[PDB]
């Protein structure tokens, strides 16, 4: 399911009970960013729990858990999950931040597919079909340049009580998206770490996005930078 | 087609050639707002031309036209068209601002239906299923409170090179919307004159909007203030 990278940014991964995965995220940097790298990142119906706790307590999906000692007393402000292989990601269940609420990012330039997935105890969750941009260990933004892959949301939809960002060369959504706010940025873009669009490529051929399904949110923004490409619905 | 109100804010309306309507809008106020009132406001395939010109010249839809002497030398910054009857509006063709480019608003609380309509030489065009709010002759905003009527966009769509606002208790769109930016505000709201949402009612029953069709625009925003009401697509 979730397979950590073998290097220093691979978190400790285990699973409990019916297979709910538990990820002790790696120590956050001075900016509060826990940068976790994976060979595989997939979530099933049992869900997954990111341990961002400074003290032991009760998680929603995985029962009682100890504090995450990797935190060294400072919880992450952003939990950044980066797939560094060629494997695409499938999210079929809930992902919970246990402990201190945090921002969540999954970056996978090979593609991300949600179907009945969701986020618990996140202020903001972003799905990025692209790569994070680092400079001297500091997160500077994200890139969907030179990428034509797809963020796909299935008929069982996606739900969160927090903010949601969907970032990909193209997006295809067929189910209900429930979020406090929905921000969808399509095309080939350079982003700041707050998802400001800094610049955009013109794709070699059209990159069309399809939102079908529905959206249950008080604020929706869709920005498509691929001139001549459309938002179908 | 277009029938001006009999009072002081009824503009002078005529038609040329195959029936293209020509509206000499009324004198703008000190804010630059030309507030035109109508018993009926409908546009057919021949289109309509709002004369906002300080000098004679060539209009796209209606041929050669003189300056609009109602302007008294100052072109309108906003051309506000208000339907004051119970009649809904049907827009089946192009509306052109002749002369100085301006903002355009059509307000009709009984409902507005676009089908193959469009806007020429407008910086921003807004369709408002609601009423303008005036205080001592100054435009203070718009209201969709206590209104459940529909802004409908037909299969032949809507096109403009400028900005577009769609404001209504509910919106049902089945065609392609082409605009520099699209802003859709649904629900029962009090608006500022720049379409800031100042407050919102909770509807007695759900006010659902349906965007189908497509959107060809680099920036789309959809804001639905009716909690529990959805954006279907």
Q: Would you call B197 an interface residue with chain A, using a CB distance cutoff of 8 Å?
A: no
Our measurement of the distance from residue B10's CA atom to the centroid of its chain's CA atoms, rounded to an integer in Å, reads: 16
Q: What are phi and psi of A62, to 5 degrees?
A: -125, 15
Q: Are strands A181-186 and B214-216 parallel, antiparallel or unpaired?
A: unpaired
Instruction: Assign B69 to helix, strand or coil.
Output: helix
Minimum distance, in Å, between the CA of residue B118 and any CA atom of chain A: 19
Minimum distance, in Å, between the CA of residue B190 and any CA atom of chain A: 16
- Taking CA–CA distances from A178, the nearest residue in chain B reads B230
* Closest in A223, A225, A232 to B214, CB measured: A232
d(C-alpha B105, C-alpha B33), whole Å = 11
CB contact under 8 A, B219 and A221: yes
**Rounded (10°) CA dihedral A60, A66, A67, A71:** -100
- Those of residues 198-217 in B touching chain A at CB distance below 8 A are 211-217
Q: A10-46: buried (b, 16+ CB within 10 Å) or exposed (e) per residue?
A: bbebebbeeebbbbbbbbbbeeebbbbbbebbbbbeb
d(C-alpha A111, C-alpha A148), whole Å = 9
Q: Are strands B122-128 and B163-168 parallel, antiparallel or unpaired?
A: parallel
d(C-alpha A36, C-alpha A68), whole Å = 14
What does the block give as tokens for B5? 């109100």
Task: Provide the CATH number for the domain formed by A1-233 in this structure.
Answer: 2.160.20.10
Give me the DSSP letters along A171-215: EEE-SEEE-SEEEEEESSEEEETT--EEEEPPPSS---EEE-SEE
DSSP tally for chain B: helices H, then strands E: 0, 28
* Closest in B215, B221, B230 to A231, CB measured: B215
CB contact under 8 A, B218 and A232: no
Which of A44, A45, A43, A26 is CA-nearest to residue A35?
A26
B215 CB neighbours in chain A (<8 A) are 222, 230-231, 233
Which of A153, A155, A152, A163 is CA-nearest to residue A218?
A163
* A-B contacts (CB, under 8 Å): 57
Sequence-distant (≥ 6) Cβ neighbours of residue A231 within 8 angstroms: A186, A209, A211, A222, A224, B214, B215, B216, B217, B220
Entry resolution (Å): 2.0
Q: Would you call A188 an interface residue with chain B, using a CB distance cutoff of 8 Å?
A: no
CB contact under 8 A, A214 and B230: yes
- Taking CA–CA distances from B223, the nearest residue in chain A reads A219
A99: phi > 0 → left, psi -120 to 50 → alpha, else beta; which?
left
Q: Would you call B219 an interface residue with chain A, using a CB distance cutoff of 8 Å?
A: yes
Instruction: Assign A149 to helix, strand or coil.
Output: coil
d(C-alpha B107, C-alpha B103), whole Å = 13
Our measurement of the distance from residue A114's CA atom to the centroid of its chain's CA atoms, rounded to an integer in Å, reads: 10
Sequence-distant (≥ 6) Cβ neighbours of residue A135 within 8 angstroms: none
d(C-alpha B131, C-alpha B44), whole Å = 23
Q: What are phi and psi of B111, to 5 degrees?
A: 125, 150
């Amino acid at each position: 399911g979730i397979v950590p990278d073998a290097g220093h940014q691979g978190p400790d991964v285990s699973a409990v009970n019916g297979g709910t995965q538990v990820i002790n995220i790696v120590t956050p940097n001075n900016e509060g960013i826990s940068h976790n790298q994976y060979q595989d990142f997939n979530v099933g119906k049992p869900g997954a729990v990111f341990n961002n706790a400074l003290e032991a307590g009760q998680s929603q999906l995985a029962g009682h858990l100890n504090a995450n000692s990797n935190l060294n007393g400072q919880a992450a402000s952003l939990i950044l999950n980066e797939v560094v292989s060629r494997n695409p990601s499938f999210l079929l269940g809930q992902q919970e931040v246990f402990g201190i609420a945090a921002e969540y990012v999954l970056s996978n330039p090979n593609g991300i597919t949600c179907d009945g997935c969701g986020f618990i105890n996140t202020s903001r969750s972003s799905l990025v079909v692209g790569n994070p941009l680092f400079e001297n260990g500091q997160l500077k933004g994200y890139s969907t340049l030179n990428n034509t892959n797809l963020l796909s949301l299935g008929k069982n939809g996606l739900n969160t009580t927090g903010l949601l960002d969907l970032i990909a060369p193209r997006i295809d959504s067929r189910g209900k998206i429930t979020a406090a706010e929905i921000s969808a940025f399509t095309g080939q873009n350079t982003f700041s770490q707050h998802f400001d669009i800094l610049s955009s490529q013109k794709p070699v051929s059209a990159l069309d996005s399809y939102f079908f399904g529905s959206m249950q949110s008080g604020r929706i923004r869709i920005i498509n930078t691929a001139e001549g490409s459309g938002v179908k619905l």
